[PDB]
Amino acid sequence: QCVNLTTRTQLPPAYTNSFTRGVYYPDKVFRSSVLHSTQDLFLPFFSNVTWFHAIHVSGTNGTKRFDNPVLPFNDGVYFASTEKSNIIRGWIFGTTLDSKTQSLLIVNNATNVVIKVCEFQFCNDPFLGVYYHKNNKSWMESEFRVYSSANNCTFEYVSQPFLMDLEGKQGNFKNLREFVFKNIDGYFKIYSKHTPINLVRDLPQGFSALEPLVDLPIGINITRFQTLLALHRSYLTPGDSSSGWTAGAAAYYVGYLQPRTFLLKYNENGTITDAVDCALDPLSETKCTLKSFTVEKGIYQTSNFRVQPTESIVRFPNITNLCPFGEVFNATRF
Amino acid sequence: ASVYAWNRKRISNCVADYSVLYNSASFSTFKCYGVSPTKLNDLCFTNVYADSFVIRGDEVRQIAPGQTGKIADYNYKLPDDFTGCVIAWNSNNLDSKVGGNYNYLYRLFRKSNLKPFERDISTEIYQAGSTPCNGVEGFNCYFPLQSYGFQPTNGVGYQPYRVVVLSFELLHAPATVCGPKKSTNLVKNKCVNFNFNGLTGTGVLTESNKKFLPFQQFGRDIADTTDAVRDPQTLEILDITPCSFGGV
Amino acid sequence: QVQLVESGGGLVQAGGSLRLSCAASGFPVYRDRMAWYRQAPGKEREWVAAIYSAGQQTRYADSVKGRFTISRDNAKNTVYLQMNSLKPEDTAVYYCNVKDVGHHYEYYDYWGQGTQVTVSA
Amino acid sequence: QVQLVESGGGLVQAGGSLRLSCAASGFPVYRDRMAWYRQAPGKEREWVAAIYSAGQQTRYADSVKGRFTISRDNAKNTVYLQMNSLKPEDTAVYYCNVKDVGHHYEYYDYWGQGTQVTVSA
Ligand SMILES: *[C@@H]1O[C@H](CO)[C@@H](O[C@@H]2O[C@H](CO)[C@@H](O)[C@H](O)[C@H]2NC(C)=O)[C@H](O)[C@H]1NC(C)=O
Ligand SMILES: *[C@@H]1O[C@H](CO)[C@@H](O[C@@H]2O[C@H](CO)[C@@H](O)[C@H](O)[C@H]2NC(C)=O)[C@H](O)[C@H]1NC(C)=O
Ligand SMILES: *[C@@H]1O[C@H](CO)[C@@H](O[C@@H]2O[C@H](CO)[C@@H](O)[C@H](O)[C@H]2NC(C)=O)[C@H](O)[C@H]1NC(C)=O
Ligand SMILES: *[C@@H]1O[C@H](CO)[C@@H](O)[C@H](O)[C@H]1NC(C)=O
Ligand SMILES: *[C@@H]1O[C@H](CO)[C@@H](O)[C@H](O)[C@H]1NC(C)=O
Ligand SMILES: *[C@@H]1O[C@H](CO)[C@@H](O)[C@H](O)[C@H]1NC(C)=O
Ligand SMILES: *[C@@H]1O[C@H](CO)[C@@H](O)[C@H](O)[C@H]1NC(C)=O
């Protein structure tokens, strides 16, 4: 069932500035008009995140950017997709990516967001492909090459019903969907944020906190993941399934979280309007020390600097004394 | 299904009501070992294994730690330290048919004692003698599967009984199945003891002019003191004030 | 009560076809194990055929494989035993057998009267 | 080990005197409690009589007072049950029951074979 797509081009990874995006609510707690300092997994401010494209450049032997590589989960992933036609259709999580170990599978079938916890037989090129039937404009699922079978299901979840458009649209980017995936204490936590944008390129400089979306108490181990896209096949791209397909224009950014301390401002409405990364620069160290976003003129002691040891050396005197082992070992008669 | 093919179901992430089962009194046997029967409603479990099958009456007592017998040794092995409950109820009025009900079969003999929670996919013929049966019966060759004579006129000891064993397993994973929770009518403007989502305390609850976000449950002011909470079943944001106190 | 009857058999020529019927009343034939044995004059008892409601559908003796079939019908409650390509070794008494378990771990075998089959060359 | 045997019972005309003997081997009868249970088809399990070596010596149901008597003999390790002024509703199976404790906190309700008692009026 699994079909390995071909004609993929090799391009070195691209990097883009994440700026001050990636702030989510660290707890369920409501806070009003306060400055709360919390240590948790986060994306550092003004850090470089990796960029992936989905585009088909026209021309003979043109570059067709269709990026679905396997990337490690580490300890939390920030996924920011800028979209116009809903290209990303879910995520897969696991360690061995086979039926030997349990795996997580989130998929949007244009009706519901379905989450399955199963020992799926992951393909070497899992994806989705929907044939474009232009004769009567009918939308129907045609190919899912993500798992060959589902065996020993352990958890099933279904979201609310809906209807998501699949036909490729023109124009600049208008949908910005940010997601944060974390795995702490046996809980798989997903936070989400949807934003309309008015821009042509890059990501907006605005600040928007990420509301919690779902928590999964499964207590499984996850080390790697892979994004999933839905491709379309039409008469304009003749050939077989491995080559006769197209992908709409879209992009996304991937970043990795780590333990950092952040100072978050809650306004009267409880909306996190601003945040400061404590370890970013000495000015932010001062802001975190003062528990204030505004620093007065003067001198402030923030932390302590100490040079770490470089190596361990063990020195001992020359070996002069030994037990009389020649009497016992190197003996002629016993 | 057959008892040797007992139906196993995995249960997680739901409210499990045992009060109705305990108070139904329609079950002949209700024996929970390793847990307190009154505390299932007050305790949460990571996963539940429901093993449902049908046996005869006298074999019910064999489903217990330290028991010996055909079902315990060769059909369904329970550990000596088993943590779970067994519910057995008579089904004579439901499983009575003309000529007897022989649909259910039970394993009679096995080469070795079954491991705990082991499912058998091999139906090897029991080798009584030195010449292996190798799927061919005869002398020193008896089939390990035996029928049940569920006759309508048979005694209660031989009557069919439906048995469900609920095994509560906890691992290095969060608890999922939880017992029912009792909700009591709220009272306002009174120094009362409150318990919201396991957060316990004392105080006075009053209406609040604050505006929670749709997902937020409770709010705490500075110095990590909860000052508001959203009452569920009404989704009402309520301010909370420490009970009036002072010196004399 | 429970009573079983075997119909068919008799004197037949070599190379013919035979169809025995085992009919049991008082208990359904769909049970753990239905057995069929052959007894020869002056020979020891040996298992021949068996049908089961679980695992393997049918089991036959090694000397009758490929030319011998058996089927059951629960609606009319009768087991048909069809055999072709008769051999002189088939002149014997056929027995239809059931086994049951008691309340005190006691096993009782109900043996059939059987039918005589004689083959003339 | 522990062995329990029942003797007595049968079919009797109402108003006679009947003897039931529950003999125990491997342990003297002198223990916490020896119970006698009467079971008939169509009803749940219900306690009838009990005799104790501690506290209250004997306990009976409210509707059986002055009708059933019990005694024990440590010399031959037996429990005697005397039935007098029987009624036809007493036709059922009688069991002598004891309780034992296991090493892994299990508790065994050891019963016997039981005796069938029928009263004809
Ligand atoms: C796994 O990916 C490879 C992509 O090359 C495909 O299966 C491989 O095919 C090669 C060449 O035919 C053979 O070495 C093996 O059949 C596969 N490789 C290995 C290392 O096993 C295919 O796309 C994927 N496999 C499946 C089952 O979908
Ligand atoms: C089946 O569901 C019913 C619905 O509540 C349960 O309740 C009993 O149902 C039986 C008929 O099946 C009635 O005779 C009882 O009066 C009902 N109540 C009680 C307290 O027993 C029932 O327990 C469920 N299970 C079975 C095996 O019937
Ligand atoms: C909790 O379950 C009960 C089912 O009886 C419902 O509670 C009612 O909630 C509505 C608002 O949704 C109130 O107007 C009623 O006063 C509540 N009580 C009733 C109808 O007796 C409801 O289904 C659930 N509550 C919520 C908040 O969803
Ligand atoms: C992002 O990448 C560019 C080029 O690879 C690099 O110069 C820049 O410093 C990176 N971002 C950060 C925060 O270092
Ligand atoms: C559109 O045409 C396809 C032809 O393959 C057919 O299967 C489908 O049912 C049609 N849609 C409708 C709504 O009739
Ligand atoms: C799930 O079932 C499969 C067999 O279908 C097997 O891997 C095993 O029994 C189960 N896996 C677990 C419990 O991890
Ligand atoms: C915050 O709340 C105030 C009063 O409750 C309201 O006037 C204001 O619009 C709110 N801010 C929002 C909704 O962004």
Numbering used by the authors:
A (entry chain B): 14 to 347
B (entry chain A): 348 to 595
C (entry chain X), D (entry chain Z): 1 to 121
Paper text:
The virus exploits its trimeric spike (S) glycoprotein to adsorb to the host cell-surface receptor, angiotensin-converting enzyme 2 (ACE2), resulting in proteolytic processing and conformational changes required for membrane fusion and cell entry. Here, we take advantage of available sequences of five SARS-CoV-2 RBD–directed sybodies: Sb14, Sb15, Sb16, Sb45, and Sb68 (previously designated Sb#14, Sb#15, Sb#16, Sb#45, and Sb#68, respectively). These sybodies effectively inhibit the ACE2–RBD interaction and neutralize viral infectivity, and a bispecific construct, consisting of Sb15 linked to Sb68, blocked ACE2 binding and neutralized both pseudotyped and infectious SARS-CoV-2 viruses. Each of the sybodies represents an immunoglobulin variable-type fold consisting of two β-sheets packed as a β-barrel linked by a disulfide bond.
We also determined cryo-EM structures of Sb45 bound to the SARS-CoV-2 spike protein. To gain further insight into the interaction of Sb45 with the full S protein, we prepared complexes of Sb45 with HexaPro S (S-6P), a stable S variant containing six beneficial proline substitutions and acquired cryo-EM images as described in Experimental procedures. In particular, Sb45-Z binds well to RBD-C with higher CC values, with additional contacts to the neighboring (up position) RBD-A. These variations in saturation of the available conformations by Sb45 reflect the mobility of the RBD. Sb16 and Sb45 may dock on all three RBDs in the trimeric S in any of the four configurations, without any apparent clash.
